[PDB]
Design a protein around this ligand. Structure first.
Ligand SMILES: [Zn+2]
Ligand SMILES: [Zn+2]
Lengths: 356, 48, 40, 96, 651
């Protein structure tokens, strides 16, 4: 059982996405039609669009310093991606759902170590027993998974029985964190924690896995999988190619081309319920709450365009020449600088209308 | 206040968990009390 | 829009330094925040 | 005057470096929620010209409260308008 | 466009100013003289080291802008420096006599050994060659700080000052003080400003009694003297009758002196909160001072070895906040005591932060439930002050000898309760009143479960007549009798045992009226116990697993039945809910191994505030110390552990 939730991006995600289209759209066009090579160009293009889709504060070529991860409000994290808001929404949907007695376990599959660091940075103060199944955990808590001498010479010591009625037990819903990398290198890491549902934050988990088919066969029912579905993306062409009924490089080029041609998606779906849908997933049923969009239909998209603001006058050079990683970072850097100057100086004068 | 208080308690489960509400408004706080009459994390007081 | 952009560019930022506490803005008001965590 | 007179003509060493004060209350200001658009809710006078005796729940209330504050220098908005440049002791919060 | 209100300055008076501070390195030379090696291992009663330790702790929190801890004028932004100057002899003579000034004058020109005899001679004081100017600086600094506050130069002042002044008496000094600092400054300000400073309210929390400060204003009505401390008259310094709580002034200062005596040490936060909530605020608002002077002493802090109390620095900030709310904003703080520099450091830090303007934090323990002695102590203080002040009358039923011949005409009320008792027992549990023939006793002395001659397990529950809770009216004096209940205490067990099909026997023994200890009850208990055991228990064929239950007294009967018989073969457990009573020692006569069976098969629950533990014998038989007081509380508390010990003792 596989399920899909249609999710889109936010404003600044589209801004930085068009920044990427300026820095790569000439080169990726040349790809379709030791600085770097076009293989590395298309791979970096693919990975950076997926990274901007997953909280664009990870686009920096630096690890988050791991003290600021737990020194930040949840809003500042979910202000980055739109996926984070829908994610945290379904999190609050399941922990504030109506609960007979269920101590329900789920596993969340991230793509790398950065994303999973953000995940433990989000749900640390929430009402879950969260366990990061990969090393270098962000504030690893010790939640363990399930499976009187007052006198002398005398001996009664009923303190043991006494203590049985005083000390209490935790009840937080279990939530497991790992990456599909380790789930490919190793196996059976999910076979042990018998979970009821898997939410795959990365929508390309390639579901029929030995560590996943052992759990699927182990289970009596069909285990429901949730793939967070971006509306149009360098994954969504291949997802289109799958849900129906070398080579990796050509697929990356084709799905990035489908995304660049499909970045101007006019129709988006909405009205996703969450508490009903999490109930649908809990009892392992196919209910119609998931949306059946499944695709969008296919020069003209190599030109970037930022959001046009009032008295703004910002433009892009589109870097119609070679590219090297240092030139790439300085270009991306001062482009984000002039974007910030535009957003600051643009906003800084609109007060006096409302004033008067 | 019911809307507000339910937003504080639902949307801040990491720094606030018990509130006290006071009504020195000489009319009794009729609607506010029923919304939290079964509720234990909030201690409501009304002078009236 | 402005605060989202500014908040993003302010922290751990992109590879060049061409441009780049009190009061406690980074969720560090010590009234049941750290002691709210499990800490085993 | 005295002869106890602790004399030490030497450059003495810093022991406690200067630290920003560890107070959690009042480097900030006071929040203020005022919006002119909650002053829609007015009665429709239907009986007669009851204008000597209008409704007690009244839009006019908010203004007088806001007014008395600026009579004591707390608000430097002269026309009694809820705008940003109120003053130094308080801080307006927008109302949506 | 219409400028309705032109911009004006904010109109407030508290906190555009700073907190006054008086500090000197010139008051650290008044020191003792070395006498014996024992001084190296003692807390050094009044040491000069108090000043710079606290002063070091201040700059660590940014409130004072001084990186190297030296006397400067640029004290930062939150506090303002108040310079000190040596007080002239006139201000000192305002309180003291003329011979004490010449005493301290002669003290300045002594040799070494004469100063040694002077240290040895004084009523817990010590002199030094640098003890004249270092004694004139405190009084002067106090007068300067109080002038700064009164004339509004600062919103409030705090003065780290030594030597103390709350023990120095007008006649001569005694109590590690040289010049009485509080009284001098108070009389010089009442003399310097008798138009604005007209009523002063002085408060003392230093754990000794401020005897000199008491005598200075014991006939003064402008100076409300309040002192809280431990009395312990025999031993505890000063050991004077001026420290007793009945010193309520004399003459025009009647009702304008108050001593608050702690019957015992070991107090904490809840006591101080409770007391400050009840007493100081009504008489303070009624007295309406124009200035509240604070005589701080941190010799009772948590971590002090002389006070032995456990008061935390949050309660200090709370009381500082209360006193700040009391007056109009004018406040002055002078320091008197302290022995453990870290406790005084953290406490002074908290008090100084609250004085700058920070709110008090919440106390580390809001629930300690204060010791019983201090309660009735404060009741007696309330009696006196209700006689004197009005805010304690009409609210505590005070309003500022029964008979001895009508005692022949009294309502019995033992038999009425026991009769009503019998009634509601028999109507729901069908108890059989068992007759003790050849003994003159009430018919309802004992009641047993029916067909008692066949039940093996028989639970014998002995207890006196029940407890009564009554409501006393607060409007005027006496108690309301119609609004009283009977606290049936032995009821949970009777029901419990009837839920497990046991022989259940009720035993009431009435109380000897107008009698301290129910000794005749104990005698009658031994008679009933022995007699019942001989005449009835040995004639029941089927019997095993007897367990006894004792409530309060009457356990002498059980002790006598155990020592003077051999009945441990059929009974297997004795349990007594002593509570507060004295111990019944087992006197074994048949054999001594019965006493060890006794001590072994036993569980006794006695109170926390009981005579002991302030270690018992095995002849008392495994007593235990409860955490709560009251028989009802401990019975409802340990009702489960008791049935656990019984069921564990049996099959
Ligand atoms: Zn009302
Ligand atoms: Zn003293």
């Amino acid at each position: 059982k596989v399920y899909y939730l249609p999710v889109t991006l936010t404003q600044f995600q589209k801004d930085l996405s068009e920044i990427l289209i300026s820095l790569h759209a000439k080169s990726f066009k040349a790809s379709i039609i030791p600085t770097l090579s076009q293989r590395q160009l298309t791979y970096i293009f693919d990975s950076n669009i997926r990274a901007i889709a997953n909280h664009p504060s990870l686009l920096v070529d630096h690890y988050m310093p791991r003290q600021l991860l737990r020194m930040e409000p949840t809003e500042s994290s979910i202000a980055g991606s739109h996926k984070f808001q829908v994610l945290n929404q379904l999190i609050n949907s399941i922990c504030f759902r109506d609960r007979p007695n269920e101590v329900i376990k789920c596993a969340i599959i991230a793509h790398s170590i950065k994303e999973l660091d953000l995940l433990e940075g989000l749900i640390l103060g929430k009402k879950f027993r969260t366990k990061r199944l990969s090393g270098t955990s962000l504030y690893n808590e010790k939640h363990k998974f399930p499976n009187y001498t007052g006198y002398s010479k005398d001996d009664y010591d009923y303190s043991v029985k006494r203590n049985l009625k005083k000390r209490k037990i935790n009840t937080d819903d279990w939530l497991f964190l790992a990456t599909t990398k380790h789930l490919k290198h190793d196996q059976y890491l999910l076979a042990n924690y018998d979970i009821d549902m898997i939410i795959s934050f990365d929508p390309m988990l390639e579901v029929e896995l030995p560590a996943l088919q052992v759990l699927r066969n182990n289970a009596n029912k069909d285990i429901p999988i949730i793939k967070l579905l971006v509306q149009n993306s360098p994954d969504h062409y291949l997802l289109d190619s799958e849900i129906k009924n070398s080579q990796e490089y050509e697929e990356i080029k084709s799905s990035l081309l489908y995304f660049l041609q499909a970045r101007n998606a006019p129709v988006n779906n909405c009205e996703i319920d969450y508490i009903k849908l999490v109930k649908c997933c809990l009892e392992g049923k196919d209910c119609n709450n998931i949306l059946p969009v499944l695709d969008l239909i296919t020069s003209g998209f190599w030109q970037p365009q930022l959001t046009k603001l009032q008295y703004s006058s910002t433009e892009l050079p589109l870097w119609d020449g070679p590219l090297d990683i240092k030139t790439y970072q300085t270009e991306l850097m001062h482009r984000a600088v002039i974007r910030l100057r535009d957003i600051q100086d643009e906003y800084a004068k609109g007060t006096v209308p409302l004033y008067e | 206040v019911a809307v507000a208080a339910k937003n504080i308690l639902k949307n801040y489960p990491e720094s606030v968990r018990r509130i006290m509400i006071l009504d020195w408004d000489i009319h009794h706080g009729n609607g506010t009390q029923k919304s939290f009459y079964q509720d234990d994390q909030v201690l409501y007081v009304s002078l009236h | 829009s402005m605060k989202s952009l500014e908040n993003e560019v302010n922290g751990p930022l992109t590879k060049f330094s061409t441009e780049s506490q009190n009061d406690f803005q980074s969720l560090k008001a010590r009234n049941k925040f750290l002691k709210n965590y499990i800490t085993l | 005057e005295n002869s106890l007179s602790t004399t030490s003509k030497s450059k003495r060493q810093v022991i406690v470096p200067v630290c920003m004060p560890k107070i959690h209350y009042s480097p900030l200001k006071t929040g203020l929620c005022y919006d002119v658009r909650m002053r829609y809710h007015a009665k429709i006078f239907t009986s007669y010209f009851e204008y000597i005796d209008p409704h007690p729940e009244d839009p006019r209330r908010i203004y007088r409260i806001y007014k008395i504050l600026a009579e004591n220098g707390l608000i430097n908005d002269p026309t009694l308008s809820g705008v940003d440049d109120l003053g130094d002791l308080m801080l307006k919060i927008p109302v949506r | 466009r219409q400028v309705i209100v032109p911009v004006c300055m904010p109109k407030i008076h508290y906190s555009p100013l700073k907190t006054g501070l008086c500090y000197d390195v010139r008051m650290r030379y008044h020191a003792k003289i070395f006498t014996s090696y024992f001084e190296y291992i003692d807390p050094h009663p009044e040491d000069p080291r108090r000043i710079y330790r606290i002063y070091k702790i201040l700059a660590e929190n940014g409130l004072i802008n001084d990186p190297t801890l030296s006397g400067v004028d640029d004290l930062g932004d939150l506090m303002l420096k108040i310079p000190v100057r040596a007080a002239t002899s006139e201000e000192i003579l305002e309180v003291h006599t003329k011979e004490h000034l010449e005493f301290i004058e002669s003290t300045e020109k002594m040799s070494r050994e004469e100063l040694l005899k002077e240290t040895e001679k004084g009523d817990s004081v010590y002199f030094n060659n640098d003890s004249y100017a270092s004694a004139r600086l405190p009084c002067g600094g106090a007068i300067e700080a109080c002038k700064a506050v009164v004339e509004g130069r600062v919103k409030n002042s705090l003065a780290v000052v030594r030597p103390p002044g709350h023990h120095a008496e007008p006649q001569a000094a005694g109590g590690f003080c040289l010049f009485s600092n509080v009284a001098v400054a108070a009389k010089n300000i009442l003399k310097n400003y008798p138009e604005s400073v007209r009523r002063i309210m002085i408060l003392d929390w230093d754990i000794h009694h401020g005897n000199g400060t008491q005598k200075s204003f014991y006939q003064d009505d402008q100076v409300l003297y309040v002192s809280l401390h431990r009395f312990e008259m025999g031993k505890y310094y000063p050991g004077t009758i001026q420290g007793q709580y009945d010193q309520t002034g004399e003459g025009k200062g009647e009702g304008f002196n108050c001593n608050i005596t702690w019957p015992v040490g070991g107090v904490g936060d809840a006591e101080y909160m409770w007391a400050f909530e009840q007493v100081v605020m009504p008489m303070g608002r009624e007295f309406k001072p124009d200035l509240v002077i604070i005589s701080s002493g941190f010799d009772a802090a948590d971590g002090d070895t002389i006070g032995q109390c456990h008061v935390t620095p949050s309660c200090y900030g709370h009381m500082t906040h209360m006193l700040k709310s009391l007056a109009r904003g004018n406040l002055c703080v002078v320091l008197e005591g302290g022995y453990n520099l870290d406790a005084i450091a953290r406490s002074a830090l908290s008090v100084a932060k609250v004085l700058i303007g920070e709110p008090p934090d919440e106390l580390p323990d809001p629930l300690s439930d204060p010791k019983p002695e201090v309660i009735e102590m404060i009741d007696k203080v309330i009696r006196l002050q209700s006689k004197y002040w009005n805010c304690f009358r009409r609210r505590h039923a005070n309003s500022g000898p029964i008979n001895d011949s009508i005692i022949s005409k009294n309502f019995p009320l033992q038999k009425a309760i026991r009769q009503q008792q019998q009634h509601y027992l028999s109507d729901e549990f069908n108890f059989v009143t068992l007759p003790l023939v050849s003994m003159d006793l009430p018919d309802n002395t004992v009641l047993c479960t029916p067909n008692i001659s066949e039940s093996n397990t028989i639970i014998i529950v002995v207890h006196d007549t029940s407890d009564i809770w009554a409501k006393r009216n607060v409007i005027s004096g006496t108690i309301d009798l119609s609004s009283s209940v009977i606290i049936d205490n032995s009821l949970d067990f009777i029901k419990w045992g009837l839920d497990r099909k046991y022989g259940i026997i009720d035993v009431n023994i009435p109380l000897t009226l107008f009698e301290p200890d129910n000794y005749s009850g104990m005698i009658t208990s031994q008679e009933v116990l022995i007699y019942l055991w001989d005449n009835y228990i040995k004639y029941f064929p089927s019997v095993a697993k007897i367990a006894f239950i004792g409530i309060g007294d009457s356990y002498s009967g059980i002790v006598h039945l155990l020592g003077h018989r051999d009945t441990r073969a059929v009974t297997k457990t004795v349990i007594n809910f002593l509570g507060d009573k004295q111990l019944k020692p087992l006197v074994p006569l048949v054999d001594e191994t019965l006493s060890e069976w006794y001590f072994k098969n036993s569980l006794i629950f006695s109170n926390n505030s009981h005579q002991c533990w302030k270690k018992p014998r095995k002849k008392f038989g495994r007593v235990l110390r409860c955490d709560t007081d009251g028989l009802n509380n401990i019975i409802e508390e340990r009702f489960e552990e008791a049935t656990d010990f019984i069921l564990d003792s049996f099959e």
